Amino acid sequence: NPYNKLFEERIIFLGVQVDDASANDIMAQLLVLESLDPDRDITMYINSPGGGFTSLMAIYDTMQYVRADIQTVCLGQAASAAAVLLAAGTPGKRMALPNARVLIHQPSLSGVIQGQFSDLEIQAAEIERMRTLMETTLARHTGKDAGVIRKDTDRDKILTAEEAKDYGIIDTVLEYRKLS
Amino acid sequence: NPYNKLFEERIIFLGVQVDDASANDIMAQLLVLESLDPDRDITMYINSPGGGFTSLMAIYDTMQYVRADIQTVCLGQAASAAAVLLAAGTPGKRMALPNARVLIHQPSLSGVIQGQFSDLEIQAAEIERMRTLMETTLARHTGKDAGVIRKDTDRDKILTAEEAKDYGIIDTVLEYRKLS
Amino acid sequence: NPYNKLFEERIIFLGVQVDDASANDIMAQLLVLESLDPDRDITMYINSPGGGFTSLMAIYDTMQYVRADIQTVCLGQAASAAAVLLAAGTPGKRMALPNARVLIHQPSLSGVIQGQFSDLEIQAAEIERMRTLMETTLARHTGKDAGVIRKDTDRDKILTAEEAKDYGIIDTVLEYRKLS
Amino acid sequence: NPYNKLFEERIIFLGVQVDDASANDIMAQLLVLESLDPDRDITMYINSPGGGFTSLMAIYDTMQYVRADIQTVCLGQAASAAAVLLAAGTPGKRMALPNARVLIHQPSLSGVIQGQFSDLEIQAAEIERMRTLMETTLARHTGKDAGVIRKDTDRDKILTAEEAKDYGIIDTVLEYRKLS
Amino acid sequence: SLTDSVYERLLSERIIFLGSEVNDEIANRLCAQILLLAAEDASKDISLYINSPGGSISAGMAIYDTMVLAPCDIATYAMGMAASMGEFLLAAGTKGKRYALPHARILMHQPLGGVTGSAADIAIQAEQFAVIKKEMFRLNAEFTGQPIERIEADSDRDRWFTAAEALEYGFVDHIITR
Amino acid sequence: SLTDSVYERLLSERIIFLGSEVNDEIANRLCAQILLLAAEDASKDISLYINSPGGSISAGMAIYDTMVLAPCDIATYAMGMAASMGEFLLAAGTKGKRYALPHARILMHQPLGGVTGSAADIAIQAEQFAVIKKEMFRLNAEFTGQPIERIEADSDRDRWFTAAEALEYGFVDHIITR
Amino acid sequence: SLTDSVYERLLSERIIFLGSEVNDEIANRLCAQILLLAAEDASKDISLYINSPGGSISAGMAIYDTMVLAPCDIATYAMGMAASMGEFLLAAGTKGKRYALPHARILMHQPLGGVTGSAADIAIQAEQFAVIKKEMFRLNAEFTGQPIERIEADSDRDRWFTAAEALEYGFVDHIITR
Amino acid sequence: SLTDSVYERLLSERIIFLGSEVNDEIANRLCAQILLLAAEDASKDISLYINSPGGSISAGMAIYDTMVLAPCDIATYAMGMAASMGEFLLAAGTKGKRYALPHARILMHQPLGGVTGSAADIAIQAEQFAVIKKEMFRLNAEFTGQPIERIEADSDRDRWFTAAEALEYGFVDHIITR
Amino acid sequence: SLTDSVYERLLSERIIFLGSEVNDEIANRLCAQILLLAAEDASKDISLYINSPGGSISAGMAIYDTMVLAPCDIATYAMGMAASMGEFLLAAGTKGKRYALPHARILMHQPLGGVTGSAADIAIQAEQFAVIKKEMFRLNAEFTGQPIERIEADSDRDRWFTAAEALEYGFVDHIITR
Ligand SMILES: CC(C)C[C@H](NC(=O)[C@H](Cc1ccccc1)NC(=O)c1cnccn1)B(O)O
Ligand SMILES: CC(C)C[C@H](NC(=O)[C@H](Cc1ccccc1)NC(=O)c1cnccn1)B(O)O
Ligand SMILES: CC(C)C[C@H](NC(=O)[C@H](Cc1ccccc1)NC(=O)c1cnccn1)B(O)O
Ligand SMILES: CC(C)C[C@H](NC(=O)[C@H](Cc1ccccc1)NC(=O)c1cnccn1)B(O)O
Ligand SMILES: CC(C)C[C@H](NC(=O)[C@H](Cc1ccccc1)NC(=O)c1cnccn1)B(O)O
Ligand SMILES: CC(C)C[C@H](NC(=O)[C@H](Cc1ccccc1)NC(=O)c1cnccn1)B(O)O
Ligand SMILES: CC(C)C[C@H](NC(=O)[C@H](Cc1ccccc1)NC(=O)c1cnccn1)B(O)O
Ligand SMILES: CC(C)C[C@H](NC(=O)[C@H](Cc1ccccc1)NC(=O)c1cnccn1)B(O)O
Ligand SMILES: CC(C)C[C@H](NC(=O)[C@H](Cc1ccccc1)NC(=O)c1cnccn1)B(O)O
């Protein structure tokens, strides 16, 4: 079973939309591979369209918690939260395939949430500290000034893997082993 | 199977929306780990958006019933009922990841319930004693005056884990162990 | 179980609509067969209607990453992304059944995405570099000038397998073996 | 399990609507029975309402590819794609039950596909070469002139098994064996 | 229309109908008709015929205030059904001029509503439901002449009345029989 | 129609109704009616009867600006319900001419809305929600004569008023009783 | 109707309303009204009152061209809300005759749209979105008198204005206060 | 209605609007209006103002045939948008009388459709799509004066025009600026 | 309405439109208009302009019988589209008075339908489909003057005609060009 043999070789496969249930699976997998061998590097494969900030920071804190280095490999897409998880790998071990896409953008409410203006001043203060935390996280891991990331994630910033290396999202664009 | 290996290492994973079926699973898991070793600490991982008050107080009473200490760890979100379950851990063992979110707010009817005014004086007296019980529970576990919590949970009170420690929801913000 | 016996004989079966979950399965299968025997050729059977560009370039980069040669065999259809994956096989090992259909066409937004014009200048710059990357990929693997492919994938270009050989999508139209 | 014991006795059961997933199962089954014994005849039971042309020509090419003779047996229905697969058996081994129905008809777009007229000149050139390929295939296997089949599949041509034998779709109407 | 034409000709004869549920649209056109008829002639009676399953409290309180502040005497007529706000506006007619047609049925019951939102919202809706229920029962006790304790006891569940039972209870003043 | 005919005859008597939620359609026809009545006679009062669950802020600000810039004195009448923008336009009447019918209920509450989109969109919606909420509370403090601190404190949740409580608070100037 | 009757009587007084979203239906009837009023009398001002959440660019460009090619001076009035195409047509009024009612709010933002179809379709939609956005910003820079660099910078996200801020920015020429 | 009343008064001034998508309902009423105006006076120009996203080919060919067979000169006016059948009927006006308002945008593109049914049905739809596309391009080459090879090349995808680009290309004859 | 007013004014000029699908509602009003115009003046021609995608056979046979039994000569006009029942009623006009506008397209095809129910129901529907198809082809052979074998052969699938091809085939008698 190919997902088992990834996990037996210490590869957590993100794969799907980052929601609660996807975040719950990875934190279960980050801690088991922490307990199996805390000194051997966990690899995290990321092909996710992102989504979720509390699901982001559940995966983010757990992959920062564990003793093992997290090797993040972007496969075809790391959008929104998944690009933050892609930068969340340990320095020197953040990888991307050459035609992988890194999409960084500020947090967004999917759909309108109603309420009184006192309720909405708090839901707006929440997405503002969701925004600053997304930028403070992505500044620890890209080496940028977090106001630069606010200017850059003002809109959808699609990064090619070669220019996600220059941005600091990843550290290495993966070279092939068949020359075609 | 990573949820089995959490449960074999005495970790109950909340994970999803607290409803009846989620509450039914945890009480089944709180009592089995009570029967396996009542002197060894049950750990409860919380990444829940909350919901449900009778499902809250089903999980709450069961994790207060068992002989084992409950180590509550907030992963990315401990909202509403889940933040009460997060405070429901034993003192000194209530943990949160550094970018976890604790959201405390008063109970709310999801959707309108119709009825005569005599029916609605009782559904309002119910959510009032749902509100006082949410505040009396959260005052036993945070050390606040339960009128302070009424002022604080008047709206949605988002707590960062460092200021959920100051609020008394958790006792320790978890430090990272990446051997680096 | 016939999909297991394909995979035990190192045959990855694409089969379905290329989306995230289909791309996640193949990259799990491309790397396991890379780890089982990196010098023995992986065969990729393609009967897909395509779809997805980040799911395309997730499968594309992984089948270009692995040490094993990828034998792409088109069964009845390689439309959209799947025709790019069909050309993504190693030269000399790109096969098609005689009545298989190869459909190459420029990337397309399924459904309207709304937004401000600054948001739409970026979603249009994205599908433009989705278009150039689809043509640069398909020019490395067909030996065309990538402006020829832009003229050819301007509309839906259905290729019969005998004229997908002349186009460079495949290298061999498969002859039948019926003892006859 | 009765479908396993069909497959262990080298009987591929078509059964359902010919779509991608049904075509993917049969090609997996045609090649496994090719690898188990390439000199022993695969039997293909057809009770399908048809559908799909690329799914047709995926099953068609694979049952023409394999070394084993394909014994096609029509059970109660071979319509559209399935009547072409019924004629796709080896000569002398194309069978039908006496009250089986063979329905041959030209390819059809299920539902309207929109587009510019340049897009629709290609979708019409596609169903025209879908139509000629359906007639060229059915002329190799029935011994007709492929313009005769165009006149005959102009509308829905329902063939009884006794007059699908005269048409050349099948070679033998199966006699009953009730030892009674 | 025809239905609007017949209602317009009865509006000329100072006969207005509450014939639907009392929502804000039917209440505003009745309040408009009472203001139009009281401005047209301030001394002739307005005949309000109630065939209503009841409706919004505030919509019916708009009608009731327009009935009271009109200088005309609003003669009310239970025509088939005066349930909920329909019995309220029936009993809100001028004393001596509240009529039940002999087979009208009067439904009296405490107000219905819905609580929603947070527990601080619902606690304020409940305070306001207690205000509306006390005021609706106070006015039904004023209209019928019953004690407010009996009004509150009878409007616990649905309390149905015939025309003769509504005459004894006090919703109507006469049962017209011609 | 009939309902449009009765409203047209009250428009001739300079009586206009805010009887629905204040959306842009009802606001534009009220603004049209106020502009039509102020052009017809610029010295007679316009009677605006409020039976409204409230509505859009900008729709009600269109009505409120048309009420103020009209040379006529807009007499407002709480008729059953003046909630949200309905209490605002009630209290926006000419001082001395803001009336509550005796069983009208006035609902006062901070504005409702919805945040959506990206975090830079929501940060601008929040700045504008703070501008609208400050301006709505400033005008309710101007209308009622209450301090803006009390207006902001009372319009935290729903704050219901009877006609007598709205008279004490300052939304209306009289409770007419005839 | 009544609402159509009040709008017809203001059309006789040369007062037309943009009171909805600017779609092609509301734009064509405004263009029809401007052509009808300019043919009726070519020297009197047309008062266009804007209560609009904005709408289609090409619908509003139809109105804007009909406003400019009319020999009448189109006096515009921000009535509650002038957003998107509503602020555009507000600022498209005759200079000296662009008014904001004192509590109107003006929303200025780059155009919204949607890309769809193939990458050659979307590349042409993007070229045309750059043409529309440049032309909308050029005209807002012409209307307000602001530089086109400031118009483009302020219309990145939603940029809200009060009546006083819109007077300083240049959308309106006066804030009428009577 | 009001909208029908303003269109009726412009129909008296021989101004008709194509203001919707060109479906058979809008085409038949335009063909009815052109036949009505050509029968009323056969020498005065009919002003057809186009604010259209385009529509059915056969609906617009009904309008185009009614425009040509009318003895009147149909003056056409690109008012905001003349896309597809809207640019066709714009360019189908009388030469010298095809106008673009200065901010109208003209969209030119090959016809859209849909193939469905069996392969013998679709082969006949494709033959007829080639006939319609050749005839639409022949008439746009006749209207604009462009070669049919350039019309076919430009109407491959969407081809947008400003009023000045449509004047150079040949859809309109003047850009009116007053 | 306006659209009904323009059609009423063309009905006074004896111009009726078949402008929709021929269902029973559009057929009955055309049959009503033909009976009304033949009773008004029994010697002047009725101009029936066809812009129709076709429709019900029995609805169009109602129109066709009303066209024939009218003492007036029904001049028919292919205006953009005459498909199915629209080409039938086009070709059903008076000989010498069947016109195609020069870019009308005529679609000729066998009738469509649906079989449903039991096998005894479907066998009777099939007998009746053979009766309708034989009668529709007999009348198209009578109208066009083509043999019924050619009508049946051409109406196998969709058979499209331009105005010039329909003139050669026999649906229309002239292509008017002015
Ligand atoms: C860049 C990081 C912060 C993640 C981004 N933030 C979000 O908008 C997502 C929301 C989302 C997006 C797509 C699908 C499902 C959920 N994160 C959130 O949960 C969220 C919630 N409220 C405000 C802002 N973000 B991205 O849109 O996923
Ligand atoms: C803070 C604690 C009390 C949990 C909070 N409670 C609630 O708001 C929840 C939300 C909810 C869930 C199901 C159905 C209706 C409403 N309240 C309740 O459980 C609830 C259920 N029935 C009546 C009244 N409240 B939170 O919103 O989850
Ligand atoms: C070779 C490939 C790139 C050509 C075709 N590509 C596309 O049309 C696909 C279809 C699609 C899938 C998901 C969402 C939207 C659109 N385009 C994309 O992958 C895509 C995805 N997001 C934005 C823009 N394009 B085909 O459908 O795979
Ligand atoms: C006779 C052979 C060619 C098969 C026939 N072809 C078709 O009409 C079916 C139609 C279909 C069925 C299921 C889902 C989608 C489309 N085969 C096709 O896929 C198809 C698609 N486009 C044109 C023609 N055929 B029959 O109708 O299955
Ligand atoms: C008249 C009274 C005593 C009984 C009933 N009236 C009500 O309670 C009505 C029924 C209704 C109408 C419209 C929408 C929702 C509810 N309720 C109200 O208007 C109401 C409910 N809660 C608070 C304030 N008013 B009856 O009219 O159905
Ligand atoms: C009047 C204020 C104080 C309270 C309430 N206001 C609102 O909730 C209304 C919501 C509404 C209602 C009907 C239609 C459209 C929008 N406020 C607004 O219009 C609004 C909301 N957010 C931003 C700007 N304006 B009430 O009117 O419901
Ligand atoms: C006035 C401008 C600056 C601001 C806004 N404009 C628009 O968003 C308008 C409204 C609209 C209409 C249909 C679909 C999408 C959007 N945009 C357009 O009309 C538009 C959109 N894409 C291309 C051309 N025009 B507002 O009017 O909504
Ligand atoms: C008009 C020319 C320039 C190009 C475009 N035409 C079309 O797309 C329209 C599509 C349409 C529109 C409304 C209702 C039904 C069908 N073309 C047709 O009407 C059409 C399509 N296929 C065959 C015959 N006519 B435009 O209108 O979008
Ligand atoms: C008119 C002739 C030449 C060809 C076509 N006729 C029809 O399809 C029409 C349209 C229609 C209406 C209702 C249900 C099914 C079909 N066929 C019939 O009216 C019809 C009459 N009898 C039996 C079955 N269908 B055309 O109108 O599309």
Describe the protein's architecture and organization.
This is part of a larger assembly, with four copies of chain A (180 residues) and five copies of chain E (178 residues). In chain A, 45% of the residues lie in helices and 23% in strands. With 180 residues, chain A is of the alpha/beta class. In chain A, strands 1, 2, 3, 4, 5, 7 and 8 form a seven-stranded mixed sheet that branches. The radius of gyration of chain A is 16 Å and the shape is globular. Chain E has 178 residues and is of the alpha/beta class. The A-C interface holds A 2-3, 5-6, 9, 11, 13, 15-17, 45, 47-49, 75-77, 97-101, 155-156, 158, 160, 174, 176-178, 180 and C 7, 20-21, 23-25, 27-29, 31-32, 35, 54-62, 64-70, 90-91, 118-119, 122-123, 125-126, 129, 133, 137, 140-141. Bound molecules: the ligand CC(C)C[C@H](NC(=O)[C@H](Cc1ccccc1)NC(=O)c1cnccn1)B(O)O (9 copies). The site of one ligand BO2 has 16 residues of chain G, from α3, α4, β6 and α5. Residues 50-53, 56, 80-81, 84, 107-110, 127, 130, 134 of chain B line the site of one copy of the ligand CC(C)C[C@H](NC(=O)[C@H](Cc1ccccc1)NC(=O)c1cnccn1)B(O)O. The PDB classes it as hydrolase. Keywords: Mycobacterium tuberculosis, Caseinolytic protease system, Activation, hydrolase. CryoEM structure of M. tuberculosis ClpC1P1P2 complex bound to bortezomib, conformation 3.
